[PDB]
Amino acid sequence: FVVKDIHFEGLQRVAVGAALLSMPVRTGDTVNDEDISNTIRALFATGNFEDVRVLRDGDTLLVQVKERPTIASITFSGNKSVKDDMLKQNLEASGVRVGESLDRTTIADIEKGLEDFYYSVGKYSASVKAVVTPLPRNRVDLKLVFQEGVAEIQQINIVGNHAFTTDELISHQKQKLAGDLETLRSYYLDRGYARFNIDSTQVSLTPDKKGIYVTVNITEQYKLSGVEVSGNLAGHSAEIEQLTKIEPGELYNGTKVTKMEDDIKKLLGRYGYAYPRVQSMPEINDADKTVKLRVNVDAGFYVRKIRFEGNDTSKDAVLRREMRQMEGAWLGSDLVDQGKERLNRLGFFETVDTDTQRVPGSPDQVDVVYKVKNTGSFNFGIGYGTESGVSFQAGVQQDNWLGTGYAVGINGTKNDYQTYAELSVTNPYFTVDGVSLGGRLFYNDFQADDADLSDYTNKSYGTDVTLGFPINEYNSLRAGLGYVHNSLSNMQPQVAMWRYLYSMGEHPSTSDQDNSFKTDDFTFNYGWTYNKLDRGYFPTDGSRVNLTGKVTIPGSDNEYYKVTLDTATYVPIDDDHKWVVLGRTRWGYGDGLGGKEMPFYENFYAGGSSTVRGFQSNTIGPKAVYFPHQASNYDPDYDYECATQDGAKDLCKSDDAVGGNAMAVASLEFITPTPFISDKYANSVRTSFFWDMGTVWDTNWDSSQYSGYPDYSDPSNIRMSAGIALQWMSPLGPLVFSYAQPFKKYDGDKAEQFQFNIGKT
Amino acid sequence: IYTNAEELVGKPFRDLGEVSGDSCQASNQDSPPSIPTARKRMQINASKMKANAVLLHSCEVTSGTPGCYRQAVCIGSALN
């Protein structure tokens, strides 16, 4: 067929010139049907035409074309994991990018491909959908919607193990496990399998992206033959034999060897050699089926600088003491280890390490550099109890506050009764012994009424410095000086209280509530303590005794001494320490010196959860003996104590406690395991059967003058209460249920059968 | 010292056991319960057990201690 004209239809983004030649036929050529399915397959093989039809007109040869749609943009939706550029990156490589003309036959293949990439992270299956939105002229927007779901695991199996059962190995989120493989490799090396090898690790999978199986294949036997030391030993050959000691029947272990390699290296380090080298080569004997260890030792002064780095909170002066050797002096590798812990013990940092660097232009000098890595600590509590009621307490701590080494604690407390606020500066390791400086500045607002006592108010302030120097690790002694100022006010007149006021030389009205007393006291405080408790929390054996002794130093308005002693003793009954016998005792006795009396705010009191359970807080001891008085806010059909306005003409016996100068309490508990709680968590729970005994009295009481009144000087009146106690470390915080029955109770003693207290931090 | 278990996710550690540290307050008119002294007394326990940092479980202030009034006790795990 003679072609005298050729024309192309549907050409847009592809010019004539292109087509004209990139087809075998041309104007003036003779054409057959062979040249048809060559021309077509050739123009199709241009990869630029959506579709092609090349056929003959009478004289003309006409090309009917549809050009491929040119990509204008590639948009992605649903791809939370894979970055949009990353996803574009994969596509650009495949052949699909903006400007390229898309092959509407490969979308499926593009889908398979992106789906294929999606194994990169956890999604081993998902669905990618092609939106191929048309645009102007013959352009297209290929949008991609990703249905990506996110890895699963339940079976971890070992094949080729004859030395151990799979379960026996299982004795010790899974997305990537590398260190864990090394840990289970060490399982075999620890049992003597030096010729143990992991041949392969397969990750099998079920149809969905959520179902993984881990198969670890193994090749597992050997033991120790002996240790042979050889090198420039530096004459310490006598010592090294002790380090390389071996027990007969020792199964080989590469870490224990390294421990010895480091121990030799440490010894030679202690002897002044900076870089001692210890190498070990194992002589493999498959014949004996035992390795013979060949150890090559190669032993290789002064300190210009002792550097401090990482101290971005603690200034570069406080840390200058925590070690066992000075700068501009000889190096002692052991002295570096002795003082190594000294930085950790402070709890001022987090991580601490050493580095020994050679001094620039020196053949013997080395700079020892210690790298130290938060100091602000915030502690907040809120509780509820029988004593304290709703109790608020908070403390702010800064251990390296503005680089002083001293720790500053600002703590505030508010119970139902007293409100306490203190500012503290502490140094737990001020000197060689481990002596502290218990600096304290404070404020205490005391409300006697809320403390279940006879009414009075004490607002007090002052300071204390207490230096505690340890003696025995079991015995610790503390001693210090304290100044206090107490402004007593609003005291409801009673014999007992007034008695003391008369001792001081102060004489107020016994019919008026209007009164105020101000004292300034200086005191010398001492406190001995012994502790041989096996555990600070829930002890099961040992004993703790505490002694407290206050004494007024001349110049103070008051003149008294106070002495208390706390005893706690635990005695275990079973070999597992689950059944214990407890013995608590508290003694207390203070008194006036200058013919005076000890202040009533410094009295001892018994009762509550604290002491003698079963009784209301502080209810034990002497009771008030009120004087007839006129109440300020007097209202009838309201109860008052010995109010003249209620018809009071003489002294009144009462129920309100006042406490006293002498007191003693004791308890004999019997700890047992909690009844139904499992051993798995039965370490947080303490049941207890206690027998409590207690008394408070007043040695300054006048039995003779007040005949119509009980003898508040008689100590013979012992109260006793027996019960059950339960302590838990519930999530809420610490707690106790102390249900007691006070069988032995005396006059007006108020009962409180169910007691308890809770915390939080 | 470590607070949570997430901080050590994927690390080779040796758990020496359990260590405790506490501060005691005998009466109302005495020094307050010192939680930072209880965190340190737990670390010296872990350093007699010989460890770098301790895994702190829960610092709580006890109400019922048979020797005091309030005692702040910090429970932890000694790690190498």
- Which residues of A fall within a CB distance of 8 Å from B20? 535-537
- Which residues of B fall within a CB distance of 8 Å from A184? none
- Which residues of B fall within a CB distance of 8 Å from A758? 63
Show contacts of A178-183: CB within 8 Å, 24+ apart: A179/B10, A179/B11, A179/B12, A180/B10, A181/A216, A183/B12
Nearest to A537 among B12, B32, B73 (CB): B73
Burial of A396 (0-12, 13-18, 19+ CB in 10 A): middle
Listed resolution, Å: 3.8
The CA distance from B37 to B72, in Å, is: 9
Pairing of strands A212-219, A197-205: antiparallel
- Which residues of B fall within a CB distance of 8 Å from A180? 10
> Are A537 and B20 within 8 A, CB to CB?
yes
The CA distance from A16 to A40, in Å, is: 16
* Nearest C-alpha in A relative to B54: A350
Provide the 8-state DSSP code for A318. Answer: G
Nearest to B44 among A345, A397, A409 (CB): A345
Distance of alpha carbon A99 from the chain centroid: 58
The CA distance from B62 to A728, in Å, is: 10
Angle separating helix axes A84-94 and A107-117, nearest 10 degrees = 130
Structural domains in chain B plus CATH codes: 1-80 (3.30.110.70)
The CA distance from A357 to A96, in Å, is: 57
Nearest to B35 among A180, A395, A544 (CB): A395
* Radius of gyration for the alpha carbons in chain A, expressed in angstroms and rounded: 45
Structural domains in chain A plus CATH codes: 1-67 (3.10.20.310), 68-150 (3.10.20.310), 151-221 (3.10.20.310), 222-300 (3.10.20.310), 301-374 (3.10.20.310), 375-761 (2.40.160.50)
CB A663 within 8 A of CB A621: yes
A557 three-state secondary structure = coil
The CA distance from A107 to B3, in Å, is: 52
Extended beta strands in A68-189, E state:
70-77, 126-134, 139-148, 153-159
Cα separation values, B34 from A184, A322, A338, A454, A670, Å = 43, 23, 28, 32, 29
* Nearest C-alpha in A relative to B70: A610
Q: Does B46 touch chain A (CB under 8 A)?
A: no
> Are B20 and A535 within 8 A, CB to CB?
yes
Closest-CA distance, A735 to chain B, in angstroms, reads 7
The CA distance from A440 to A428, in Å, is: 14
> Are B61 and A733 within 8 A, CB to CB?
yes
CB pairs A-B closer than 8 Å: 123
> Are B59 and A761 within 8 A, CB to CB?
yes
Provide the 8-state DSSP code for A172. Answer: -
Identify from B48, B52, B60 which residue to disrupt to test chain A contact, counting A C-beta atoms within 10 A and taking the largest count: B60
Mapped to the 3 state alphabet, what secondary structure does A592-609 carry?
A: ECCCCCCCHHHCECECCC
Using alpha carbons only, give the angle A588, A590, A592 rounded to the nearest 5 degrees. 170
Q: Does B40 touch chain A (CB under 8 A)?
A: yes
Q: What backbone phi and psi angles, to 5 degrees, belong to A718?
A: -95, 125
Query: Tokens 């592809």, residue?
Result: A14
CB A633 within 8 A of CB A643: no
Q: Does B37 touch chain A (CB under 8 A)?
A: yes
Q: What backbone phi and psi angles, to 5 degrees, belong to A654?
A: -140, -175
> Are B53 and A350 within 8 A, CB to CB?
yes
- Which residues of A fall within a CB distance of 8 Å from B21? 536
* Nearest C-alpha in A relative to B68: A610
> Residue A20: which H helix or E strand, with range?
helix A16-21
Angle separating helix axes A179-189 and A254-270, nearest 10 degrees = 90
Q: Which residues contact B79 (CB under 8 A, 6 or more apart)?
A: B2, B8, B13, B14, B15, B16, B46, B51, B52, B53, B54, B55
Q: Which two tokens stand for residue A240?
A: 């090294």
Would you give the end-to-end CA distance of chain B in angstroms?
12
